[PDB]
Design an enzyme around this catalytic site. Structure first.
Site, PDB file in Angstrom:
ATOM      1  CG  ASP A  44      -2.145  -0.934   1.069  1.00  0.00           C
ATOM      2  OD1 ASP A  44      -3.313  -0.513   0.906  1.00  0.00           O
ATOM      3  OD2 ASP A  44      -1.892  -2.186   1.183  1.00  0.00           O
ATOM      4  CG  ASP A  46      -1.195   6.576   4.015  1.00  0.00           C
ATOM      5  OD1 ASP A  46      -1.769   6.136   4.730  1.00  0.00           O
ATOM      6  OD2 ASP A  46      -1.224   7.924   3.585  1.00  0.00           O
ATOM      7  CG  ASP A  86      -4.875   4.314   2.156  1.00  0.00           C
ATOM      8  OD1 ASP A  86      -5.728   5.132   1.886  1.00  0.00           O
ATOM      9  OD2 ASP A  86      -4.619   4.089   3.279  1.00  0.00           O
ATOM     10  CB  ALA A 100      -9.370  13.521   8.175  1.00  0.00           C
TER      11      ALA A 100
END
Length: 185
Positions: A44, A46, A86, A100
């Site tokens: 993944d 990110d 991601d 966030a």
């Protein structure tokens, strides 16, 4: 594998520059960039991009030749070739881009890390640890794979124990508040 992953990151960066979309590299990849060494390979990738630019992001993925698998409340997952993107939305608030639910300074404007000789903006150690601790609440450390455990250790050591402790206390407080809100409602 490793070269391919690095190359993909380079491509995504290049597309982002072309779009005039700021990119902050996150997670283990950020840690490795900040270290200066791609210590571990990660399936993944990110990456943190401003949420408002979702359309541009879709275009970027299309330019890469990948397809956006799904969009989720906390960001979108896209498959690019044999590697996973991601994307964590950065929210532009108070004239700053912030991850966030994360502390101020999550995504510094400065060129924090370097990948393959290319200087790259990376999320702060504090942001990185915030994500990992958040994941810890979801999944027990015993369950955590070696890569994540090591990445967390590296980030914590680099930031400093006291700062990490403060982050942990802050996040626990945040979670307790959230639970109380939920229980009240």
């Amino acid at each position: 594998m490793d070269t391919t992953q690095v190359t993909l990151i380079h491509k995504i960066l290049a597309a982002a520059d072309e779009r005039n979309l700021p990119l902050w590299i996150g997670g283990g990849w950020a840690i490795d960039a900040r270290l200066g060494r791609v210590t571990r390979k990660h399936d993944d990738i990110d990456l943190t991009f401003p949420g408002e630019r979702r359309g541009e992001l879709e275009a970027i993925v299309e330019m890469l030749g990948g397809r956006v698998m799904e969009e989720l409340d906390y960001g979108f997952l896209a498959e690019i070739g044999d590697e996973l993107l991601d994307c964590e939305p950065a929210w532009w608030a108070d004239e700053a881009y912030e991850i966030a639910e994360a502390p101020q300074g999550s995504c510094p404007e400065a060129a924090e890390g370097v990948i393959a000789g290319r200087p790259v903006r990376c999320n702060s150690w504090e942001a990185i640890i915030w994500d990992y601790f958040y994941y810890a609440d979801e999944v027990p450390p015993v369950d955590w794979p070696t890569k994540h455990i090591e990445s967390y250790r590296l980030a914590c050591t680099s930031l400093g124990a006291e700062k990490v402790e403060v982050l942990r206390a802050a996040f626990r407080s945040r979670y307790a508040a959230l639970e109380h809100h939920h229980h009240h409602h």
